[PDB]
Scaffold this active site. Structure first.
Site, short mmCIF file in Angstrom:
data_model
loop_
_atom_site.label_atom_id
_atom_site.label_comp_id
_atom_site.label_asym_id
_atom_site.label_seq_id
_atom_site.Cartn_x
_atom_site.Cartn_y
_atom_site.Cartn_z
N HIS B 62 3.97 8.72 -9.69
CA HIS B 62 3.45 7.52 -9.03
C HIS B 62 4.57 6.71 -8.40
O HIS B 62 4.46 6.27 -7.26
CB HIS B 62 2.66 6.67 -10.05
CG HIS B 62 1.97 5.47 -9.46
ND1 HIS B 62 1.33 4.53 -10.24
CD2 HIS B 62 1.83 5.04 -8.18
CE1 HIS B 62 0.82 3.58 -9.47
NE2 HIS B 62 1.11 3.87 -8.21
N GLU B 65 5.98 8.40 -5.39
CA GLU B 65 5.10 8.17 -4.24
C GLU B 65 5.34 6.80 -3.62
O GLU B 65 5.42 6.67 -2.40
CB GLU B 65 3.61 8.33 -4.63
CG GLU B 65 2.69 7.91 -3.50
CD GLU B 65 1.25 7.80 -3.89
OE1 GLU B 65 0.85 8.37 -4.92
OE2 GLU B 65 0.49 7.15 -3.15
N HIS B 66 5.44 5.76 -4.46
CA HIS B 66 5.83 4.44 -3.94
C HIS B 66 7.23 4.47 -3.34
O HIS B 66 7.46 3.90 -2.26
CB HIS B 66 5.77 3.39 -5.05
CG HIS B 66 4.39 2.86 -5.31
ND1 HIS B 66 4.14 1.52 -5.50
CD2 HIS B 66 3.20 3.49 -5.40
CE1 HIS B 66 2.84 1.35 -5.70
NE2 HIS B 66 2.25 2.53 -5.64
N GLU B 143 -0.23 -2.80 -10.64
CA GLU B 143 -1.28 -1.82 -10.37
C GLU B 143 -1.83 -1.25 -11.66
O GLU B 143 -3.04 -0.97 -11.77
CB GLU B 143 -0.76 -0.70 -9.47
CG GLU B 143 -0.77 -1.04 -7.99
CD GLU B 143 -0.01 -0.04 -7.12
OE1 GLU B 143 -0.01 1.18 -7.42
OE2 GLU B 143 0.58 -0.49 -6.13
ZN LIG Z 1 0.46 2.98 -6.53
#
Ligand SMILES: [Zn+2]
Ligand SMILES: [Zn+2]
Lengths: 766, 770
Positions: B62, B65-66, B143
């Site tokens: 994750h 990806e950020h 998030e």
């Molecule tokens: Zn995210």
């Protein structure tokens, strides 16, 4: 995670779309919507062929096919699909095969409903007038006499002779005066019973393909497909004898496998694309390298609901027994090799095969779906297909000029069949290899010297390099075959990288064509210089076998095609180079690389022809060229052609049965445009054909005064609509820009009947 | 035999083409040439997901990806893909899944090479700066806290809890301030080993789709895909475990989850979906609705490993009783058995119907489907073998109820209240399903003597579309609207087989009844609309009531900023207006007569200004949503608005999302709501308040108040030339094309273009000072 809340407006790609239906009457429908397309096309396939004719009526199905074009309940033969297509400048054909029959046409988008109106009518309610039967008995007997001398027809009969299973497999099916009979009344009820029994909607399939939407195509299906009538197994083939067939021509080896007829046949198109691949490592490269053979094609013929013959058709070199065993041994090992293709290779070759398909015309795509090889699907059961075929029973047909046996009447044709003298198979242990990864394209060095180069449509995308000889005769026949032999490996490699390289005649004009990215043309032109300089002796030999095959193939054509072959030389050391598209720097680097092209490059700066043949067939080929270069002329010649063509055919083919070939068309040949007339007869002499053509010209002299200015406006609109639009695919488009000049022509349109009548007489009087 | 000699010269149809390659470096390439398309798109998929993160680093994927959108060797975060897609107005996103990751964008055709440049650079050489890591730990932990309240996140964790097979299945994968840790230099070494291990060409597939020729797409794939790293794992299949009840706020669901091998051909799943979602009588939804067992379904597919997948049938149910869940399973199993009988003609009809819905998607979403979702259908795919594979698969049940017992527990780092599944017995035999096969001709409806008004734009033009819309926003209640849908949904599915369209949907705040097809079809459908909608049996009004309550519960459980967007139409504000867009005078005039018996009075279309709208939420999420309406309706105006929004959009994003993490939702976009065009601002934050977010937007409008004068005349000329090219084109599909003509007025908006800075800023004043 995304920080967007509301999605941006999105516009769909607007691609090709398919749809399938079953009408309430039982008709299957397949629509293919191709937005923006120029052409629309349609094809109805019936589940009945030759094999379904009653044993007592040879060629009944063939005769039925002819007769469906002879008038129906709501359209005479002239106003029917034949005459309507011809007026429209469309295409139209039909085929009766062993177990299936198909009718199909291609026109511009809009008049599609009128065409299906007529295809629907002739299929549902043909007149079958005794008077028309009488005529077409003669037309088929003529076609029959001509087919008794055709290589392919006799090869296909010979192949069926290698198998057994049921009577119809070895019957006569073309038809003939003898076979049709004297009782025209009993022939006409045999027709009616065949048609009534098989031409039902539950027994038919309609394909529709056009720029129309799926909804418009559905409605046309409902409308015209709904008006068809509403409302039995063959055993499978068993392997028999190998044979040799004695025939004039280049020798062949045809390996024929008997297979079940599966619903999923797209794998065969991928197989075809691999079989026809010229790249090093492949099957053709191996056969040529050892001078065993030079070409192959794939035949697929359904012989029943669950039975089919798949034929690998080689042109061979010596035709010797050890040649055949080497070839068959190579094919079985190559088929084994194909088991190792990775998913990526299957996808690559599979989608390569399908883009060869999407590049066919609508008519020919629908033909392939209905009777030929469908598009490929990436998740077929490839290795299961392979293992089915390699295990299938297979027989061998050697075709040879001297073969032994004596001629015999088989399936109504003269077949000289003798025993197959085979040698033992010797395992092919040398590995075949196939494309997988594509590397970066080399960057060629530039020569210091530099040749002249025409550059058209500069800085436009999809550049095309066209190299051509100064004239007809600036490149010899034997040199062309040397060009094709040497560039064939390399053009195959370029096709995987998405480049195009070819050396082919285009309307009498030899063209070397190069297209792809900017790197591709540079690399390719470099590859061309090297491949064509130091030519190894295999490739000189191969080029000599290819020329021999080309000569033999011509001597054994029908005469009208042989006369057409002779037209270029009857109409008549430096090359010319034109780049269409690409930036200035491309033009200049190509300018340097053209200097190493083995032929000097220079910068780019007829009365009527009558050809005839005599003997067992009589043929007339008349070419009336336009002497001018005027825009108004080249327009008028095309309007004339369009008005002449349906009249010529109706008068000399359907009314009077002059012969089997009857055609008046526009034709370009070695940059000369003009009007073409073609006739071939079993009875009338060449000079008698020239007389009837002259009589037709005199008819037109007084008849075109009277053409309804309604008909002329529709003709000049229709042809401006066909012509103003340059081609999509850039190779055809690059020739149309550099050679034909379609642009400058629709310029002179329309014109008056006074100007047209003026151009007429300037054309057809001395 | 044919009488011709020379072939008639013919032109190919210029259709879609596809090609596949493999570069030297190992990259797979899949190209799709779509001649004449407006958009091009590209997707890279990488064979690595969360399951591949080291157990010691929850959420490493994750974060990667950020962190790939925070600058790369040749591009900052602003010059890179994110900022560049924003400028050019394209679409961009990314997804880390269990075992696969994808990055993808969509733009206009020509600039595709620029995007591949940036995409290639961020995939190959991300900076991964510590200052940006530490910064992105905050965004992700926020998030995380938000996702502990997401129904679907928790549902997807409960489904995995019903299976076993390998540790990562039940690990925590979102990440958190806790999980990432305090040793930022050790986190950065972990990222970079993860990237350097999985982000190599032999592990990547590149999809490209545009109007470019195959040869051009091939050249681009070589240029940018060859600049990816080179040099070159399995997970065991899944075992079924326990059924469960998960307790969550929201409409009750039943989720039937089959554990499957992950096969190479999965297009048969797209055909199954077209059948599953079909509203026709005789199928599965119609049967659930006739018995009020439930109202919706959807198909989930999750790759879990090389030969392991979960296929989940996700039903919105009515009551959620043990007896209802067992009726739905009994129906599904019977229905799957029914699909066994589909004839080759039915398989070909539904498979190609399915592919047509695929081809209506935008490029970006087709590539997403190919790479991560349901591929296109193939017409020879051993249907019954894959149905037999599914019906023999182990399966587990997840009931989702508002109160289901048990007590919360921390599972995959998520709060989950798992209860035992209350299971009734299957109903041993049950009624047979039936599916469309043959199309009969379409009934010709009779006219009424009466007559209604009806405009008629683009007369005697092909592909007609009939648009009926209520007079205003309050001309039709969110109750009747839900009742219109329930009565036509059966009849709309049957017209879909015959290739016409019938819909009652909200289009940018406007309820719209759409009918399209042949002229016969519109007349038939319009007649059916009247009959079906006149008298609604209590069944249909109950169905509408269930659907309305479902809409309400979905709304009040969504993220705040989405609930506020749902309130915007109300915050901006009984007869109907009839338009026909194409078709004969005789079509118009018979349609004219058949509209008289529309159960709502049709009238003729008649011929004000709105202050700005501020919507706000305070609580655990803080969200602001501001819509500055344009108050006139001049062309130059409705053009200037679109130029500003294009200029504002990346600026709003670069300052508020990237430069200051002000929240995980940040967007400035032109927006169009119940016919009012304007500029829309949306923000949601876990720390700032709605009024503080209003302040940054207030602040932001002042920056552009000054900064806008200083924009390079080339960036403005460029911005108006990309705006004008895209805008002047009318949509492909005839429905969108009908709305754009008869409502949006797209042609007029670009009549005014281009504009000079003096009235761009003139229009910026009126919009925001007033
Ligand atoms: Zn995210
Ligand atoms: Zn014939």
């Amino acid at each position: 995670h995304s920080s967007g809340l509301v999605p941006r407006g999105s516009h769909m790609a607007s691609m090709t779309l398919a749809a399938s239906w079953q009408l309430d009457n039982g008709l299957a429908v397949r629509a293919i919507s191709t937005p923006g397309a120029e052409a629309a096309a349609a094809l109805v396939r019936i589940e009945a062929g030759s094999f379904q004719a009653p044993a007592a009526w040879p060629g009944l199905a063939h005769l039925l096919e002819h007769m469906l074009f002879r008038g129906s309940a709501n359209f005479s033969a002239q106003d029917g699909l034949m005459g309507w297509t011809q007026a429209a400048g469309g295409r139209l054909n039909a085929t009766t095969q062993a177990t299936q029959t198909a009718f199909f046409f291609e026109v511009g988008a809009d008049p599609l409903a009128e065409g299906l109106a007529r295809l629907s009518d002739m299929l549902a309610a043909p007149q079958l007038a005794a008077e028309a039967i009488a005529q077409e008995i003669e037309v088929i007997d003529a076609e029959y006499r001509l087919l008794r001398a055709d290589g392919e027809t006799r090869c296909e009969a010979a192949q069926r002779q290698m198998f057994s299973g049921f009577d119809a497999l070895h019957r006569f099916h073309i038809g003939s005066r003898a076979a049709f009979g004297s009782d025209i009344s009993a022939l006409q009820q045999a027709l009616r019973q065949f048609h009534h029994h098989y031409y039902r909607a539950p027994n038919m399939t309609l394909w529709l393909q056009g720029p129309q939407s799926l909804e418009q195509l559905h409605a046309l299906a409902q409308r015209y497909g709904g008006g068809l009538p509403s409302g039995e197994t063959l055993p499978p083939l068993a392997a028999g004898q190998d044979y040799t067939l004695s025939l004039p021509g280049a020798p062949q080896l045809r390996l024929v496998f008997t297979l079940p007829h599966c619903r999923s046949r797209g794998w065969l198109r991928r197989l075809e694309r691999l079989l026809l691949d010229d790249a090093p490592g492949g099957l053709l490269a191996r056969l040529r390298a050892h001078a065993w053979g030079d070409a192959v094609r794939l035949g697929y013929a359904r012989c029943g609901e669950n039975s089919a013959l798949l034929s690998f058709i080689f042109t061979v070199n010596h035709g010797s027994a050890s040649e055949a065993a080497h070839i068959e041994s190579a094919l079985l090992a190559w088929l084994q090799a194909l088991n190792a293709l990775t998913p990526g290779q299957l996808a690559h070759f599979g989608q390569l095969a399908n883009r060869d398909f999407h590049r066919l015309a609508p008519l020919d795509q629908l033909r392939a779906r209905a009777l030929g090889l469908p598009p490929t699907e990436q998740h077929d059961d490839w290795t299961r297909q392979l293992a089915m075929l390699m295990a299938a029973p297979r027989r061998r047909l050697a075709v040879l000029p001297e073969g032994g046996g004596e001629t015999r009447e088989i399936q109504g044709l003269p077949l000289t069949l003798g025993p197959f003298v085979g040698a033992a198979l010797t395992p092919t242990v040398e590995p075949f290899r196939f494309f997988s990864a594509s590397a970066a394209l080399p960057i060629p060095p530039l020569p210091a010297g530099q040749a002249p180069l025409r550059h058209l449509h500069p800085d436009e995308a999809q550049p095309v390099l066209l190299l051509r000889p100064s004239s007809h005769g600036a490149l010899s026949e034997e040199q062309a075959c040397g060009l094709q032999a040497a560039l064939r490996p390399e053009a195959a490699e370029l096709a995987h990288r998405e480049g195009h390289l070819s050396v082919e005649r285009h309307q009498g004009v030899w063209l070397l064509q190069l297209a792809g990215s900017h790197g591709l043309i540079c690399h390719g032109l470099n590859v061309v210089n090297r491949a064509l300089t130091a030519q190894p002796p295999a490739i000189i030999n191969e080029a000599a076998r290819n020329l021999r095959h080309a000569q033999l193939k011509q001597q054994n054509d029908i005469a009208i095609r042989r006369l057409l072959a002779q037209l270029p030389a009857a109409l008549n050391p430096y090359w010319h180079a034109t780049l269409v598209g690409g930036d200035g720097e491309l033009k200049r680097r190509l300018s340097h690389l053209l200097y190493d092209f083995p032929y000097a490059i220079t910068a780019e700066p007829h009365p009527p022809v009558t050809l005839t043949e005599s003997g067992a067939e009589h043929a007339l080929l008349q070419f009336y060229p336009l002497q001018s270069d005027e825009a108004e002329g080249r327009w008028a010649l095309r309007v004339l052609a369009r008005l002449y063509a349906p009249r010529y055919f109706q008068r000399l083919r359907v009314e009077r049965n002059v012969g089997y070939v009857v055609q008046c068309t526009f034709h370009r040949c070695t940059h000369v445009e003009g009007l073409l007339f073609a006739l071939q007869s079993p009875t009338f002499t060449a000079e008698q054909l020239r007389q009837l053509t002259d009589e037709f010209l005199q008819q037109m002299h007084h008849e075109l005064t009277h053409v309804s200015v309604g008909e002329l406006e529709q003709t000049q609109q229709a042809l401006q609509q066909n012509l103003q639009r340059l081609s999509a695919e850039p190779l055809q488009r690059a020739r149309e820009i550099a050679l034909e000049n379609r642009a400058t022509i629709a310029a002179a349109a329309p014109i008056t009947l006074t100007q047209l009548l003026h151009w007429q007489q300037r054309l057809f009087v001395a």
